[PDB]
Ligand binder design. Structure first.
Ligand SMILES: [Mg+2]
Ligand SMILES: [Mg+2]
Ligand SMILES: [Mg+2]
Ligand SMILES: [Mg+2]
Lengths: 254, 254
């Protein structure tokens, strides 16, 4: 029987995490450790300058007060869940986590804190706000898959589910992260005293959203599965950077 | 003359950013947009549910109230600095940003918001707290390098500088991100009422810190330069994941 640490970024009160919890609890042992509020956009932020306080609800759900998604899964794996989880599942997020958006994603960051466990961590996002049932069914299928046979490579799976009835989901695609044009919108709003305050605007239009991208798969009505890692190295740039330094004489006398 | 957006994660009052600002201001036009406090560990977190307020100091430095490093550079590039910057520089951080730590780094996240500009963004971290002068000299050299000849590939450079007098710095190494064993320490501390609160503990020991890693370069007394990107795809896992799904019958009827 699977021991699952269930988290998210929308917080313990989100219908996405509550729907998923109910679904997982009929075949696995589930412990929720999640934020006390909506921490969308929290990325892999974590609390270093202060200790963290936990609040427990009547049903055993743990909220970490002011806790980030990373905080929650870190504490869950390393202190709060005993015996330790076999797997971390983060979701179901209200909204997609696609392309270069993933760098900002609390949903994904929560899953990343489960990267050292025996099973790949799952981040699960719904491309909308209606069909949580569909995302729950997809998640359960993946977990049953993992019970059938272990995944040998890939420590985090980023799963995006079309906001459609399950019957309309076309299948599954293994994808890579797409990307957007640079986001540049800032929305000013005056306070009552006439001071200009600034909202972060919507993202840029899709740029890389073709063959084999997560964007394209979801658009076409497929579940997108993208294996992720935490190595941020642009390996392909190595020789260019090295040659550039030599060319401009930085790091060398000659 | 270079127009530089200067940020960090330690905030506007940090000696690292103040030291660097002074150094850059004698050959470039510099605008500081940085957090109002120490936001170490903020990763690429950004403020979505609220507007952001800016506070300006006597010297023209802009602090974004409760602003994350990502918030600061985003607003700087897209609203607060006119004309727009040619480059983003984030640092000098008090402490290294190496290996898999970079996913949690506010220093690096700030630089990433400059990835769309004409010059590669620089994240600059000191491996200690003494020789900011050394890190400043290294940063200036890189910027002069960029004025000599453009870097054709690599949109973010993660720079780590040994905490040594410049004369003792051995040179420069183009590196890849190393990694650590899983971090698992949690430090409990009782509040005055007898409630257990939890601190995030120190990172795990170095795991991948050999040939060509950022860890190794800094340890040996070299400046480490690692080109980064925002594509989190584990490309090497693609076929394994695809074959696994087929094997366990997830996404396929057969
Ligand atoms: Mg969310
Ligand atoms: Mg030289
Ligand atoms: Mg810092
Ligand atoms: Mg099947």
């Amino acid at each position: 029987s699977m021991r699952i640490l269930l988290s998210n970024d929308d917080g313990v009160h989100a219908p996405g995490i509550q729907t998923l919890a109910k679904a997982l609890r009929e075949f696995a042992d589930v412990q929720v450790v999640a934020p006390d509020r909506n921490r969308s956009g929290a990325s892999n932020s974590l609390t270093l300058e202060s200790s963290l306080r936990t609040f427990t609800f009547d049903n055993g759900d743990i909220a970490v007060q002011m806790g980030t998604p990373t905080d929650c899964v870190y504490l869950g794996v390393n202190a709060l869940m005993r015996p330790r989880p076999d797997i971390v599942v983060s979701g179901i997020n209200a909204g997609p986590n696609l392309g270069d958006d993933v760098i900002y994603s609390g949903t994904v960051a929560a899953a990343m804190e489960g990267r050292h466990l025996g099973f790949p961590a799952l981040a699960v996002s719904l491309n909308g706000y209606q069909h949580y049932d569909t995302a729950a069914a997809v998640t359960c299928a993946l977990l049953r898959g993992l019970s059938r046979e272990p995944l040998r490579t890939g420590r985090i799976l980023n799963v995006n589910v079309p906001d459609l009835p399950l019957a309309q989901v076309k299948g599954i695609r293994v994808t890579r992260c797409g990307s957007r044009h640079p986001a540049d919108k800032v929305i000013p709003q005056e306070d009552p005293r006439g001071n200009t305050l600034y909202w972060i605007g919507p993202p840029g239009d899709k740029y890389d959203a073709g063959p084999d991208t997560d964007f394209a798969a979801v658009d076409e009505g497929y579940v997108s599965v993208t294996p992720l890692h935490v190595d941020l190295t642009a390996h392909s740039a190595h020789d260019v950077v090295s040659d550039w330094l030599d060319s401009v004489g930085v790091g060398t006398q000659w």
